[PDB]
Amino acid sequence: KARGNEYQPSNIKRKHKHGWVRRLRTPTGVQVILRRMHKGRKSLSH
């Protein structure tokens, strides 16, 4: 009906989807971390 509230916060969902452990379990994720490390990001992951 009205839109834009699409983000409904959960810490569990957040850290399961985007968390450090999640990024490190697949080789693709590890490449994500690696890219951000390269670009010098302050936060590599959630």
Partner: protein, 122 residues
Amino acid sequence: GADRMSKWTSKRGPRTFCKGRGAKGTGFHGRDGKFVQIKEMIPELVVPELAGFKLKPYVNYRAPEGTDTPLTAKQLFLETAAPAIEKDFKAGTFDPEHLEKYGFEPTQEGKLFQLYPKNFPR
């Protein structure tokens, strides 16, 4: 958009999220669900009697400093093992097999405080 930067802490999550602030565990969970403390895991402060002794938190200003010599393995070898070794080689009683009389320890696993895997905090 949540918070990425701020550090993750027990204050942040759900009820199910409990993460200590880094104190060390003193025990385990027992039968009744009640928690059991092991007297051995709780640090026992060893405190000497301070009353009868003379030293203070500060030093007199006119008292001199000294030439700064960092203690080396060598100097410590010379203040302890060197007099005894020279004494027993000059007497011909020196035994290259057992050095244990001079204070050398072959292995660390016997004694209470071991140096290499480092059994004691402080």
